[PDB]
Amino acid sequence: TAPTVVALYDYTANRSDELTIHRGDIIRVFFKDNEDWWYGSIGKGQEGYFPANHVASETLYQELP
């Protein structure tokens, strides 16, 4: 429920409690709120919601072409 994942697709924050993520960014998941929205960190003091459908496992990311 609290993996380290990688952004596959860019997302721009659209609320004050969201992250902006870019493809390749490493995200430390803190919570899986529901199937659509997860919450986690991109760095010291940088936390927020992000869409689950924009991320992938480290394994998948490293196996892309």
Swiss-Prot record:
Every SH3 domain range: 1-60
Signal peptide: none
Localization annotation: Cytoplasm, Cytoskeleton, Cilium basal body; Cell junction, Adherens junction; Cytoplasm, Cytoskeleton, Microtubule organizing center, Centrosome, Centriole
Induction: Down-regulated during early differentiation of normal hematopoietic cells. Up-regulated in leukemic cells at all stages of differentiation from patients with chronic myeloid leukemia.
Tissues in which the protein is found: Highly expressed in the most primitive normal hematopoietic cells. Expressed in brain, particularly in neurons that give rise to the crossing axons of the corticospinal tract and superior cerebellar peduncles. Expressed in kidney (renal collecting duct cells) (at protein level).
Domain of life of the native organism: Eukaryota
Physiological role: Involved in vesicle trafficking and required for ciliogenesis, formation of primary non-motile cilium, and recruitment of RAB8A to the basal body of primary cilium. Component of the tectonic-like complex, a complex localized at the transition zone of primary cilia and acting as a barrier that prevents diffusion of transmembrane proteins between the cilia and plasma membranes. Involved in neuronal differentiation. As a positive modulator of classical Wnt signaling, may play a crucial role in ciliary signaling during cerebellum embryonic development.
Subunit: Self-associates. Part of the tectonic-like complex (also named B9 complex). Interacts with MKS1. Interacts with NPHP1; probably as heterodimers and/or AHI1(2):NPHP1(2) heterotetramers. Interacts (via SH3 domain) with the dynamin GTPase DNM2. Interacts with HAP1; probably as AHI1(2):HAP1(2) heterotetramers. Interacts with RAB8A. Interacts with CEND1. Interacts with CTNNB1/beta-catenin. Interacts with SPATA7.
Clinical condition linked: Joubert syndrome 3: A disorder presenting with cerebellar ataxia, oculomotor apraxia, hypotonia, neonatal breathing abnormalities and psychomotor delay. Neuroradiologically, it is characterized by cerebellar vermian hypoplasia/aplasia, thickened and reoriented superior cerebellar peduncles, and an abnormally large interpeduncular fossa, giving the appearance of a molar tooth on transaxial slices (molar tooth sign). Additional variable features include retinal dystrophy and renal disease.
Protein name: Jouberin
Name of the coding gene: AHI1
